[PDB]
Amino acid sequence: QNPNCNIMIFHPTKEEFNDFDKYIAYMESQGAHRAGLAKIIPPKEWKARETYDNISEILIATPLQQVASGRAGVFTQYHKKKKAMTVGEYRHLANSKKYQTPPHQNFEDLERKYWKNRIYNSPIYGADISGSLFDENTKQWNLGHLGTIQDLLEKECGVVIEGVNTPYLYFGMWKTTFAWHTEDMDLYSINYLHLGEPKTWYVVPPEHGQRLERLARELFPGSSRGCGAFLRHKVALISPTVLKENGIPFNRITQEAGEFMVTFPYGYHAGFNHGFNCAEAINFATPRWIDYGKMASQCSCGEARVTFSMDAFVRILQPERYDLWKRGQD
């Protein structure tokens, strides 16, 4: 199923939107995970929140300026902290002459402009904000309350890691960027675009993830000095042209406001925002993730320090393999 690893798009009914884990399993039964990314369009009647009329006063404590260096589709990006500003102030800044989406004729044109001009006018991203815009009354696909087996991390081990098992908000503007990465511990992620302009995603099928890692070693000198998990640093930007020239299989898709994207374990992804927007995202897990969690690379230089023990997950959800697993641990 899904032999070509196409990004699949799902349209669950209201009845199918009641049980998150069940629907994820269904998607995988149709081969969705092979692409590394899927889109879920919610039932017509569903809404995340009644209104967004009163979000302009939210304070973005630490907006980040995203400074890219490089050329010809290959860049490194680093972040500079900027002064706090409200979402209202941020929206005004996003829409200002310096930062507004350039005039363009179509997606392909905007995409070319993104890659060609990435070093100019470093954009400001209101990223990694602890919080949620889902109404408490929204009981289906509420990112604050998905009820997956990832809940063991807090329940069993008392571990809370912001953004992993608590939700993040992202206020974006044109050119704001997520670099190539898998999730910490190779978890799934889910991302809901609440409002505003689109978000474009690139994804390499998990089966080809190692080829992306090899390419990153070829493109980024010194990337392995002192660390075996460079891409966990989330500093590498690599254009689709460069992926194509180097034979790395990938796909692209644009997420619109009101749509969910799910990334699957070890599905490398990267992308960018088209203009002012607001997304919310969180990690989650399933039983199928456990063996990925066991295998996940870990940064060994202190740059990317999100990690946790797999013990509780194997102990509780893989009881018949727990002794075998422990033997491999020592």
């Binding site: 680093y78 972040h79 500079k80 990694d128 953004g163 670099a179 999100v306």
Partner: peptide, 10 residues
């Protein structure tokens, strides 16, 4: 304390 991050600093 470790938390999910969009990228790297400095």
């Amino acid at each position: 304390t470790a938390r999910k991050s969009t990228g790297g600093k400095a």
